[PDB]
Design an enzyme around this catalytic site. Structure first.
Site, short mmCIF file in Angstrom:
data_model
loop_
_atom_site.label_atom_id
_atom_site.label_comp_id
_atom_site.label_asym_id
_atom_site.label_seq_id
_atom_site.Cartn_x
_atom_site.Cartn_y
_atom_site.Cartn_z
N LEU A 76 52.28 26.12 38.72
CA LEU A 76 50.87 26.43 38.52
C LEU A 76 50.71 27.48 37.44
CD1 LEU A 76 49.62 26.48 42.26
CD2 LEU A 76 49.43 24.61 40.59
N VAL B 239 54.93 34.28 39.08
CA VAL B 239 54.47 32.91 38.90
C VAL B 239 54.23 32.24 40.24
CG1 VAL B 239 54.77 30.86 37.49
CG2 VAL B 239 56.06 32.95 37.01
N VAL B 240 53.27 31.32 40.25
CA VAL B 240 52.79 30.70 41.47
C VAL B 240 53.19 29.24 41.47
CG1 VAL B 240 50.82 32.22 41.78
CG2 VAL B 240 50.63 30.23 40.36
N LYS C 78 52.74 32.69 45.60
CA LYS C 78 52.98 33.55 44.45
C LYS C 78 54.25 34.35 44.71
CE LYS C 78 49.75 36.18 42.11
NZ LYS C 78 49.28 37.21 41.12
N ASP D 299 41.10 43.84 39.38
CA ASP D 299 41.53 42.86 38.38
C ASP D 299 40.66 41.60 38.40
OD1 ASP D 299 42.94 41.47 36.43
OD2 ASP D 299 44.82 41.24 37.57
N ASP E 161 52.61 50.28 42.44
CA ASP E 161 53.62 51.18 41.88
C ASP E 161 54.96 50.47 41.68
OD1 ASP E 161 51.60 53.16 41.92
OD2 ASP E 161 52.46 54.20 43.66
C1 LIG Z 1 47.49 45.28 43.47
C2 LIG Z 1 47.82 43.79 43.66
C3 LIG Z 1 47.91 43.49 45.03
O1 LIG Z 1 47.75 44.33 45.88
N1 LIG Z 1 48.18 42.26 45.43
C4 LIG Z 1 48.27 42.13 46.89
C5 LIG Z 1 48.38 41.26 44.53
N2 LIG Z 1 48.64 39.84 44.98
C6 LIG Z 1 47.57 39.03 45.74
C7 LIG Z 1 46.48 39.64 46.39
C8 LIG Z 1 45.51 38.93 47.13
C9 LIG Z 1 45.56 37.54 47.25
I1 LIG Z 1 44.11 36.45 48.36
C10 LIG Z 1 46.63 36.91 46.62
C11 LIG Z 1 47.61 37.62 45.89
F1 LIG Z 1 48.59 36.88 45.32
C12 LIG Z 1 48.31 41.49 43.08
C13 LIG Z 1 48.53 40.42 42.16
O2 LIG Z 1 48.77 39.34 42.58
N3 LIG Z 1 48.46 40.60 40.83
C14 LIG Z 1 48.71 39.47 39.89
C15 LIG Z 1 49.36 38.07 39.98
C16 LIG Z 1 50.11 39.21 39.29
C17 LIG Z 1 48.18 41.83 40.32
O3 LIG Z 1 48.13 41.93 39.13
N4 LIG Z 1 48.01 42.93 41.16
C18 LIG Z 1 47.56 44.08 40.59
C19 LIG Z 1 46.17 44.13 40.85
C20 LIG Z 1 45.31 45.16 40.47
C21 LIG Z 1 45.82 46.19 39.72
C22 LIG Z 1 47.19 46.18 39.40
N5 LIG Z 1 47.68 47.32 38.61
C23 LIG Z 1 46.96 48.58 38.32
O4 LIG Z 1 45.84 48.84 38.71
C24 LIG Z 1 47.79 49.56 37.44
C25 LIG Z 1 47.19 50.96 37.22
O5 LIG Z 1 47.57 51.80 38.30
C26 LIG Z 1 46.52 51.97 39.25
C27 LIG Z 1 46.83 53.18 40.17
O6 LIG Z 1 45.83 53.20 41.17
C28 LIG Z 1 46.35 53.47 42.47
C29 LIG Z 1 45.19 53.60 43.50
N6 LIG Z 1 44.67 54.99 43.51
C30 LIG Z 1 43.22 55.27 43.68
O7 LIG Z 1 42.46 54.36 43.82
C31 LIG Z 1 42.69 56.74 43.66
C32 LIG Z 1 41.14 56.88 43.42
C33 LIG Z 1 40.54 58.21 44.00
N7 LIG Z 1 39.76 58.37 45.16
C34 LIG Z 1 39.44 59.66 45.31
C35 LIG Z 1 38.63 60.09 46.47
C36 LIG Z 1 37.97 59.10 47.34
C37 LIG Z 1 36.99 59.28 48.39
C38 LIG Z 1 36.71 57.98 48.88
C39 LIG Z 1 37.49 57.05 48.15
C40 LIG Z 1 37.50 55.62 48.37
C41 LIG Z 1 37.22 54.59 47.45
C42 LIG Z 1 37.37 53.36 48.09
C43 LIG Z 1 37.74 53.68 49.40
N8 LIG Z 1 37.81 55.00 49.52
N9 LIG Z 1 38.25 57.78 47.22
B1 LIG Z 1 39.28 57.31 46.16
F2 LIG Z 1 38.60 56.06 45.25
F3 LIG Z 1 40.63 56.68 46.95
C44 LIG Z 1 40.02 60.41 44.22
C45 LIG Z 1 40.70 59.48 43.41
C46 LIG Z 1 48.08 45.13 39.81
C47 LIG Z 1 48.02 42.76 42.59
N1 LIG Z 2 45.75 29.92 44.75
C1 LIG Z 2 45.91 29.29 43.58
N2 LIG Z 2 45.71 27.95 43.53
C2 LIG Z 2 45.88 27.31 42.36
N3 LIG Z 2 46.21 27.82 41.17
C3 LIG Z 2 46.39 29.15 41.24
C4 LIG Z 2 46.26 29.94 42.38
N4 LIG Z 2 46.53 31.26 42.08
C5 LIG Z 2 46.80 31.25 40.80
N5 LIG Z 2 46.74 30.01 40.23
C6 LIG Z 2 47.00 29.69 38.83
O1 LIG Z 2 48.28 30.20 38.49
C7 LIG Z 2 48.29 30.69 37.13
C8 LIG Z 2 48.74 32.12 37.11
O2 LIG Z 2 47.88 32.89 37.97
P1 LIG Z 2 48.11 34.43 38.15
O3 LIG Z 2 49.36 34.71 38.99
O4 LIG Z 2 46.89 35.05 38.72
O5 LIG Z 2 48.44 34.95 36.67
P2 LIG Z 2 47.40 35.01 35.50
O6 LIG Z 2 46.28 34.10 35.83
O7 LIG Z 2 48.06 34.48 34.19
N6 LIG Z 2 46.85 36.60 35.33
P3 LIG Z 2 47.08 37.58 36.72
O8 LIG Z 2 46.34 36.98 37.98
O9 LIG Z 2 46.70 39.02 36.55
O10 LIG Z 2 48.63 37.58 37.00
C9 LIG Z 2 46.89 30.43 36.58
O11 LIG Z 2 46.92 29.23 35.82
C10 LIG Z 2 46.04 30.34 37.85
O12 LIG Z 2 44.93 29.46 37.72
#
Ligand SMILES: Cc1c(=O)n(C)c(Nc2ccc(I)cc2F)c2c(=O)n(C3CC3)c(=O)n(-c3cccc(NC(=O)CCOCCOCCNC(=O)CCC4=[N+]5C(=Cc6ccc(-c7ccc[nH]7)n6[B-]5(F)F)C=C4)c3)c12
Ligand SMILES: Nc1ncnc2c1ncn2[C@@H]1O[C@H](COP(=O)(O)OP(=O)(O)NP(=O)(O)O)[C@@H](O)[C@H]1O
Ligand SMILES: Nc1ncnc2c1ncn2[C@@H]1O[C@H](COP(=O)(O)OP(=O)(O)NP(=O)(O)O)[C@@H](O)[C@H]1O
Lengths: 303, 277
Positions: free
Chosen positions: A34, A35-36, A51, A144, A171
């Site tokens: 679809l 890496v996934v 994924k 995101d 992280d």
């Molecule tokens: C994270 C992520 C992920 O989990 N899963 C599970 C992923 N998979 C996935 C998920 C769901 C489903 I269905 C299916 C899945 F497949 C992915 C993921 O698939 N993919 C893709 C395919 C490759 C991702 O790319 N990412 C990912 C996503 C988003 C971002 C990133 N990278 C970055 O963002 C890098 C930059 O570093 C960010 C560092 O920030 C850490 C968090 N620090 C804070 O917020 C502090 C804020 C703050 N606050 C303060 C005070 C207070 C008071 C109340 C509150 C508050 C606010 C809200 C509540 N309380 N705050 B306060 F805001 F905390 C003071 C400061 C990477 C994925």
């Molecule tokens: N649940 C899903 N069902 C079908 N296709 C999916 C699904 N999740 C992701 N894809 C596809 O898989 C590919 C890669 O998805 P994804 O892992 O989210 O990477 P990306 O789209 O290139 N950018 P990012 O989501 O930040 O990594 C894309 O072509 C999506 O459309």
């Protein structure tokens, strides 16, 4: 904030997860990339999407990871794709979720030319109500939002995915990809404090890319709009310092044009917040519309 | 078209290869025997004569290096598609792993010393017309006061950047890159054509100096796109938030200076580091 046709499909999904129990590598048989991957669970006749993020870190962290991805069991919505389980295997954590047969909106836009305004009106409600769910019932922001992570199906639901739940998986991921299309808000680029307003902007810029059929930075000149080689830093410096992109005056209704303009305000305080957008004319008009989304989907994609 | 191991002044009878020392983006690094040595095997395309004659250009240079703060280049046999580079093996831990070990005291006198060692080594490689292009704490070794720089010049011939329209950026790389470089990263950028300089290498030392006191990299919180914009436009942290005086914090302003010509040579920097309390 509640339907019943929607209440049947979620109760139908909560029963399909009782069927799986626990998971491990040998349960799954690769169908298609679809890496996934789209894969076929054998202990349960349920086609999932898996994924596979590659991670290489000591065991006290990979368990801290899986504990935080357990939260997606609890979150459940008709505007959020369904989470089944999260397990570690072979130096890669795997997240198996609901598979969605239409794909992401960036590949349906890749095949279609542009997406007509009426369909974009529905998805905005999906997205609008999607994010409002996680801010109100889980205190998480998506972090995101972009076309690649908005998913469609032949049944006609639209839901979000790929959102920031696990601060330790953030992280633990070792390296990030950057390309010519950025969806990051100008306040995140500058390192200042940020809230769900970033996701609203990321939605605005996604909506004008889908309505035009071209990523809108840098904006095209009059020669390319009639018929309808850059470095990362000058694209990002354009996003912070140049006036934001905007829909073409002629071909889109004034409600729509404003709707994105209010998302693409630079100052995140003046930008529309989550439920200001709930009551905007443009989504009050599309709400009370009858579009056969599944119909436009299966007709232009071919399924 | 080839390089034999008898072409070296290190007498070579037999070379043994042991276990893998660690994962890395560029070839593999094994334990070896000759004494004990570190063998980096790298793979090339069978017939890419333009990158291979560019590589022989490098190693002839390293054949001339000897300096107590630079890893000892021992030999390099090139029979395509397989190549090796043999340097001596570093006892002890990377400066990266030492900075991050809670059990390790890093007082402001000792960090001033560890920085002076790197600077000496780096003056020596500059003296001989050799840019490092990948100075970092994971490429500096520390063991009870001896400090060795490794992996110099490899980045030219490296290929650590290689998805479609999407540049792979690894955590920690961008905050070593001077702005003249950051401003030029594209999904078409190639390591052999980035504008490295003696100035960009001094910038990278600044990032180690920050890291020595903060015990983490700068821009640790921020995403990659954020880092590129912040750093292209000149925004740099300081060390006042953890109570470091004016002089420890004046180092960074000189090394991280926005216009290259304002950044010191390594000689000048060695003088500035002697004047700390
Ligand atoms: C994270 C992520 C992920 O989990 N899963 C599970 C992923 N998979 C996935 C998920 C769901 C489903 I269905 C299916 C899945 F497949 C992915 C993921 O698939 N993919 C893709 C395919 C490759 C991702 O790319 N990412 C990912 C996503 C988003 C971002 C990133 N990278 C970055 O963002 C890098 C930059 O570093 C960010 C560092 O920030 C850490 C968090 N620090 C804070 O917020 C502090 C804020 C703050 N606050 C303060 C005070 C207070 C008071 C109340 C509150 C508050 C606010 C809200 C509540 N309380 N705050 B306060 F805001 F905390 C003071 C400061 C990477 C994925
Ligand atoms: N649940 C899903 N069902 C079908 N296709 C999916 C699904 N999740 C992701 N894809 C596809 O898989 C590919 C890669 O998805 P994804 O892992 O989210 O990477 P990306 O789209 O290139 N950018 P990012 O989501 O930040 O990594 C894309 O072509 C999506 O459309
Ligand atoms: N001379 C040496 N003596 C001992 N260990 C070494 C030596 N050179 C490299 N290593 C180790 O071998 C592994 C691979 O080295 P290298 O490919 O430079 O990885 P790295 O420079 O630490 N990270 P990166 O360049 O970002 O991939 C790491 O565990 C290094 O610490």
């Amino acid at each position: 904030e509640l339907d019943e046709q929607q209440r049947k499909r979620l109760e139908a999904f909560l029963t399909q997860k009782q069927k799986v129990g626990e998971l491990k590598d040998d349960d799954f048989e690769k169908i298609s990339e679809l890496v996934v991957f789209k894969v076929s669970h054998k202990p349960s006749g349920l086609v999932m999407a898996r994924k596979l993020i590659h991670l290489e870190i000591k065991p006290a962290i990979r368990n801290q990871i899986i504990r935080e991805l357990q939260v997606l069991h609890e979150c459940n919505s008709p505007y959020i794709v369904g989470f089944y389980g999260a397990f570690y295997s072979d130096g890669e954590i795997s997240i198996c979720m609901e598979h969605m047969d239409g794909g992401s909106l960036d590949q349906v836009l890749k095949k279609a030319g542009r997406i007509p305004e009426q369909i974009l009106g529905k998805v905005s409600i999906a997205v609008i109500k999607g994010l409002t769910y996680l801010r109100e019932k889980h205190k998480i922001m998506h972090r995101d939002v972009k076309p690649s992570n908005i998913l469609v199906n032949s049944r006609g639901e639209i839901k979000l995915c790929d959102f920031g739940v696990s601060g330790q998986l953030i992280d633990s991921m070792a390296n990030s990809f950057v390309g010519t299309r950025s969806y990051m808000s100008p306040e995140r680029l500058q390192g200042t404090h940020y809230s769900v307003q970033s996701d609203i902007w990321s939605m605005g810029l996604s909506l004008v890319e889908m309505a035009v059929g071209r990523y809108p930075i840098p904006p095209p000149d009059a020669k390319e709009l009639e018929l309808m080689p850059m470095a990362i830093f000058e694209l990002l410096d354009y996003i912070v310092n140049e006036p934001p992109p905007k829909l073409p005056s002629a071909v889109f209704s004034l409600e729509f044009q404003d709707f994105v303009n209010k998302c693409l305000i630079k100052n995140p305080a003046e930008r529309a917040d989550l439920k200001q957008l709930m009551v905007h004319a443009f989504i009050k008009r599309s709400d009370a519309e009858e579009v056969d989304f599944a119909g436009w989907l299966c007709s232009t994609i071919g399924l | 078209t080839s390089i034999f191991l008898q072409e070296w002044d290190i007498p070579f009878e037999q070379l043994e290869i042991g276990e893998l020392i660690g994962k890395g983006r560029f070839g593999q690094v094994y334990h070896g025997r000759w004494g004990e040595v570190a063998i980096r095997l790298i793979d090339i395309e069978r017939d890419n004569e333009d990158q291979l004659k560019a590589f022989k250009r490098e190693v002839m240079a390293y054949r001339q290096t000897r300096h107590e703060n630079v890893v000892l280049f021992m030999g390099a046999c090139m029979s395509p598609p397989h190549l090796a580079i043999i340097t001596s093996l570093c006892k002890g831990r990377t400066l990266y792993s030492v900075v991050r070990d809670a059990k390790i005291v890093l007082d402001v006198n000792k960090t001033r010393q560890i920085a002076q060692e790197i600077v000496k080594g780096m003056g020596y490689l500059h003296a001989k017309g050799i840019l490092h292009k990948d100075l970092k704490s994971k490429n500096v070794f520390y063991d009870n006061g001896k400090v060795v720089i490794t992996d110099f010049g490899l980045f030219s011939i490296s290929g650590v950047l290689q998805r479609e329209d999407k540049l792979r950026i690894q955590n920690g790389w961008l905050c070593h890159l001077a702005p003249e470089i950051i401003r030029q990263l594209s999904p078409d950028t190639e390591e052999d054509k980035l504008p490295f300089s003696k100035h960009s290498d001094v910038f990278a030392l600044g990032t180690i100096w920050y890291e020595l006191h903060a015990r983490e990299w700068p821009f640790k919180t921020q995403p990659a796109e954020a880092i590129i914009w912040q750093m292209g436009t000149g925004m740099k942290p300081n060390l006042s938030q953890i109570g470091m005086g004016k002089e420890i914090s004046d180092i960074l302003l000189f090394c991280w200076a926005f216009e290259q010509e304002e950044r010191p040579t390594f000689t000048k920097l060695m003088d500035m580091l002697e004047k700390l309390p």
